[model samples]
Target chain A: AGVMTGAKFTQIQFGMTRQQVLDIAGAENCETGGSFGDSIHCRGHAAGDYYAYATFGFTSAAADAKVDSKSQEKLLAPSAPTLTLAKFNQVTVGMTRAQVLATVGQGSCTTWSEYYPAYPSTAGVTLSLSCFDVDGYSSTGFYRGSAHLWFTDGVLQGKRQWDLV
Target chain B: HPETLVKVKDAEDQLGARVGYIELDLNSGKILESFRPEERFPMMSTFKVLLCGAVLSRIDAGQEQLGRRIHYSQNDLVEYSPVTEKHLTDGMTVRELCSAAITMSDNTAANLLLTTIGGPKELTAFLHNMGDHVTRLDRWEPELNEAIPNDERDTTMPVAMATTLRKLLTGELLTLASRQQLIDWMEAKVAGPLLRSALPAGWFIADKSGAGERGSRGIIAALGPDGKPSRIVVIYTTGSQATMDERNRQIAEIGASLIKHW
Candidate 1:
């Protein structure tokens, strides 16, 4: 469902409200912060799988504002991470990715994935990494609250926490 | 250099990997030959050389002893520990662990040595202390071999590795006795069949090579013909679809070119 095609992204007008952004990007796939300690610097992946920023004028121009700038690359990162601490804790070096899949299941960010389960059978031509946010997406950084899993020849060669505990 | 460059470029295309290397005059500290010497590649088992050297430093400092025996249960064994697997009952001396890790590439033994020097972070700190800013070890064996994108966990540039290796084995970072011991370990078949096979009879070699999935392979060496200027050469590759045999062959050709160049 998170197929953030180009046309869908362009449909996002600059003056769109935060709720409007939620509707277009998807409510479950973002992290936002504002005023008590920090102002709104909304970061999230659109259904288009985009990470964009916006600034508000408040007509008064919201300081730390409505949105600043938006950017995305249709990445190898998941829009919303689903790996729990339990699943990550069970992970071990040399465990097959299949074992990891059974343990952690699949995540939501599916860009660059032509097939299902999100990512398909990769040739593993590179030291591949699969990342996911723990509870869900968090603002700031691409794979911000994600669990990073490194695979080699389909084995769980390594794993790390991106920003989440 | 151009002639050798042609061979290196050919290896890259054939192996489908970026091949980076640096050749240095071990005594004079002059760069003899190089290609993408500053770029990074997962140091893989090649890191064990540095990892073991750090332990040697601790031994020289009286902080650790080589004759110390470390016992471990089956649970402590990491994947690919050939020597340690068989020696489980007798355990291994600190010196033997270094030899097993350096010469045989024993994963478990390397980890044993790694824990002795603190951990991955400590090995990295040791490298920085030796004046190498480009090398870093962020995880234990197996995991540290993860050559993932944008994650420079356990990686080193060819130049950085070569420089650091020289410092450990030849510079003051290790005592003369420790340096000779380290070199002795590396001298005994330190892994890279392709490059080793490519060397002619007159040259001698001592090296440590590593491989990760998807055709990642590397070697750091001190090699030379009997009386010629000795060289500390390092070569590492990443992102290849080629099989190990094919990749090794390509490196063999690079070694051939390295020889022809001199």
Candidate 2:
């Protein structure tokens, strides 16, 4: 299951520090969805300061404690506690307000389509690109993570990354 | 088998069109060989097989008399003659329309029979009812203006039509008379290159041919020998983006080569 628990971050002023940002989002997040250099995937998270990408695995009790302390609701519900994203396995065209919650947990982050080159451009239609960042704090109150979802059409096509510094 | 495949491969490369070949022995119903036989393609006008079945079924139920005259409207005249461009000299019986439609790939005659037999929508519904979900007719162009959307005509997939043909040949799709009528209608077809070139010259080849743009063409042939009955071969292709002659010749070559080995 690919799921993320609620997160929080202590002060490190990761705005200018690249290493600080990379510590939170696993290394896999950085290279995914064609995010490279000063792309939107990097720039938006820099703008957000910090965000969280939910990792869906059996929630460690300690992690569950931190999630409960920081955010409002359970990231994974009783039915779909585990989430897995595989290539060629199609998802909904657009991520609904509900499914995103199932991944990250209840929180406030501006969700919209971000465009970049190599993504098919559709005029007058909002498409999710490797743009936008997921900004949130961890439960232990020690770490912070930011997330940016890569989307095509409306579905969560892929996730660019998440970082906790 | 590889030699046969090599010939088919050479033909495809030389012809510059997609081809599928299937060979089933007439006496044993065994598949002697095939190439890309399971590949799906659009049915094009070869869908008239189902239309023929639908009309004959109506006759079987006595809901419509096959001998009754159904006149071609001016609109119907516009669609035919890719094969025979002449307008109907006079109104014809439903049976005659069926004959002309299948034998000549006459759009107007087929659509005329389509309407009289239950229209494309109902015909599709009938196909679905028979558990053949892949074959369907969705659009008719000559009847539609700007308001008439493009999706109005019928659409059918190859595998579904092939299965339906199997049903028909086995008398599973219709009553005996209706089934016999379909065999007669299809065997009467006069145009298209797939069947005549593929099967042995004297074999009872009951089939139909369809051709359109983008190198879309198809053939469905059934063979029944002296002691055995009900062996079917259907080859459908589209989106080859080649010339019509090129596509037709490729289909014929594929078919002929398969029969040679079969």
Candidate 3:
């Protein structure tokens, strides 16, 4: 469990070569932010006292694609991982709202502005774009990690999760 | 409706300005009353409503995410971005940007949201998609608020403004939740001070207002009494030598007249 000390995080600067970033910020800890993108978004591993996350936008999906941009966050792991990014990735499209709530549990931040974008339909109008926010905070209360699961007609459609740093 | 027009025109004469207005039947798509409904007026912050509407449209289409973190530096900010100014380092989600732009009328927040849908033209394209040919956004803020006489850039007819407001809010473009969210943001109660104050008690009033170089000020609102259907009200003014108070009061008096007559 090696911490991403300021000095090491500093070396993970913007526009660093792809391998260079992978070297400083551990590689195997990555996860896809996209199927979603040649975007190459990944999360760094749980380190000494905290977990670190980095998002890299590769020019293309190629193994040697250039790293167009990079972002990194470091924070203590949540006391509970119920609503973590990995859990968010598990809630898939077409799953009922009940199932999603079950997967992530109820968020500490359930009031993240649930919305419904209207779409015309045979029943006059159909509801879409309802949002549910699932938040997890560090056990020590350092940062609030948030994830938004979008639902149309009470089913999962899209998701956005922010790093808790 | 005709009598309401007379009162609106009287305010214009008192202030030496052109007052454009419309009171629309939200449920019926009817024009309950209007004045200069077709003449163009600079949109100013009024455009932020539609700007965010387009952003919400993208979200509805699954093309964007409200919780997507958009990071920026100090250099990316502009003046009057009270909310965005505070988030330069950590960045804000699309929801926060929409709230800041609509509720606080944050100039930088509006610009940041504008970038998400492409730009001024892209929003105009969204308007076109909504079957609104008269409302057009040709530039960003500060510049858009110029309100130059006869300049159609960044302008919309009062009727077009009212119609567009209806289409976005109660129309099929946004989800019920998004529409309600926009309504809540407009209800932040910042810009339409004079207009809202002028209206009597017990009406649901949520508005997005704009002010600019000239003695120009305008408000587009959703108005109604308790438990009844709400109507859209769009009012704007330009070319006045009247003091800011007088300009605002003139607009207020117009709102007063709506209650007085209807």
- Which CAPRI tier for candidate 3? incorrect
Q: How many clashing pairs in candidate 1? A: 11
DockQ (CA atoms), all models? 0.01, 0.01, 0.01
Model 2 spans with C-alpha error above 4 angstroms: A1-165, B1-4, B15-17, B20-39, B82-89, B141-155, B198-201, B224-230
Between candidates 1 and 2, which one is better according to TM-score? Answer: 1
Better of 2 and 3 by lDDT: 3
Give the per-residue lDDT of model 2 (tens digit) for A25-101: 33334321211112112111100001222221111223221111111111211221122232112224356635665
> Model 2: how far is B253 from its true place, Å?
1.8
lDDT (C-alpha) at residue A109 in model 3: 26
The true-versus-predicted C-alpha distance at residue A65 of model 1, in Å, is 80
Chain A TM-scores of each predicted structure, in the order given, are 0.40, 0.26, 0.35
lDDT of each: 0.65, 0.48, 0.66
Stretches of candidate 1 off by over 4 Å are A1-165, B190-192, B227-229
Error of 3 at B146 (Å): 1.1
Winner on lDDT (1 vs 2): 1
Lowest summed lDDT across 10 adjacent residues in model 2 chain B is found at: B141-150
Please provide, for model 1 over B89-130, each residue's C-alpha lDDT reduced to its tens digit, 9 standing for 90 to 100: 468889989888877676778898888888988988888877
